[PDB]
Amino acid sequence: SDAEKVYDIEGYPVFLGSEYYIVSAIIGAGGGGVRPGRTRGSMCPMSIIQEQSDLQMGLPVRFSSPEEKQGKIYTDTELEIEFVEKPDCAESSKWVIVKDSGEARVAIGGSEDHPQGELVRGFFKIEKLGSLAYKLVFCPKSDSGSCSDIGINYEGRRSLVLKSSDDVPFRVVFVKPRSGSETES
């Protein structure tokens, strides 16, 4: 329920709990998928970067919801995101918002990986960006009544950040990884 259903590029619903690559949509600004990446000035890669090549779909993620453990994903509904793999220096691969430079960025790891005061509590949501794309948004807890678009900060590292305006979202589509009898990690 709530709005419209979110589908992968194959036309199938995006399911909570299943693995999906998040890659740049055809109407995007180029590039591939996302993955944890090196943080400028840190030994532990806790930033999220977008691949420069559309040949690289990045690392898969799985979506979860505070209302149901399974089911189809609908736009404009609360979601939490996590990569299916995490660095050993991080306690988790969950996506979080870290604000400590005027400009909030999307990172991985929770309260055990970042100073509490730096994290911004809230939920993610997937919004439809036409019929050829989607975009991710983050809705702060305290800011009850406003969500910021997730966009790319182009600086050679294509890192994911929260945009102040809604004119520069990272346009994406969802791709299910290939499998069969088993999907080792």
Q: What are the sequence ranges of the domains in the chain?
A: 1-185
Helix, strand, coil distribution of the chain in percent, nearest 5 = 0, 35, 60
**Domain 1-185 is of which CATH architecture?**
Trefoil (2.80)
Which technique was used to obtain these atomic coordinates? X-ray
**What is the number of helices (H) and of strands (E) in the chain?**
0, 12
CB atoms within 10 A of CB 11: 6
With H, G, I as helix, E, B as strand and everything else as coil, classify residue 116: helix
CB atoms within 10 A of CB 95: 24
- Structure token digits, residue 160: 């994911």
Task: Cite the DSSP H helix spans in 70-182.
Answer: none
Q: Which residues pair with 72 in a beta bridge?
A: 15
Q: In angstroms, what is the resolution?
A: 1.8
Asked if 149 and 135 count as a contact pair (C-beta separation under 8 A), the reply is: yes
Burial letters 68-91, b for 16+ CB under 10 A, else e:
eeeeebbbebebbbbbeebbeebe
> 116 — phi, psi (to 5°)?
-45, -50
Q: Residues 6 or more apart from 176 whose CB is under 8 A from it? A: 8, 10, 12, 18, 19, 20, 21
